[PDB]
């Protein structure tokens, strides 16, 4: 169906990930974007 046999104790781990940058939070609060003065009262 969807199998995979991998080692875990080796110096390398299969399918290695890459957390290049953290989970930075991007926000649209108030007088920081135009969505809220020259637009509706929208925030993303």
């Amino acid at each position: 169906f969807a199998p995979a046999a991998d080692p875990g104790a080796a110096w390398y781990l299969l399918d290695t990930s890459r957390s290049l940058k953290p989970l930075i939070y991007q926000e649209r609060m108030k007088p920081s974007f135009t969505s809220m003065t020259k637009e509706d009262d929208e925030q993303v």
Binding site: A10, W11, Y12, L13, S17, S19, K21, P22
Partner: protein
Amino acid sequence: VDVYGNPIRTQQLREPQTSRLAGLAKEFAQHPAKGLTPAKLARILVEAEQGNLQAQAELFMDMEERDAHLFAEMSKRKRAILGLDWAVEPPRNASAAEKADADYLHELLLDLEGLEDLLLDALDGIGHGYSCIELEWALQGREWMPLAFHHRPQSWFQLNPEDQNELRLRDNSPAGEALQPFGWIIHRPRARSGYVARSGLFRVLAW
């Protein structure tokens, strides 16, 4: 238990935590100081801020080795501490039992070989921002003893993804491994207020 309240189990004290990580002992420093440019240094520092302390630690080691003035200053600063006489004192208005405990601890520290090396290894955290010394626990009958103090390179650790102030071993997993209680002496001097990654003096001295 320990000071932080974490449960303490004497079973895990027979073997060092890093014994089951034979991969670490075979690594060699990558020497990131050679061919270093301001952009590379900025990238190294930023990546260290995000939990990749290996490159930062190796760069700091190279910086210490390759600069004679900086090395002399750091050595003088550390030798200042290494030459101070020390004593163990009982708590405020301590009782007879507490005084006896303090006296026994003082006698044990006096007769404990390798204290100066332990202090020197701990003082590395001044420049590196954190120093970890692994403990070897042995039983000479009924009393536990620190067999030896092992200083582990700062490149062997990382930051917890869920906590920027908590260090963890590099065990090939994303989250690393939590530090064993009673298995380390972690020294983290605080020159500036902030996270552990930004707390090193070499971060100020790099430029």
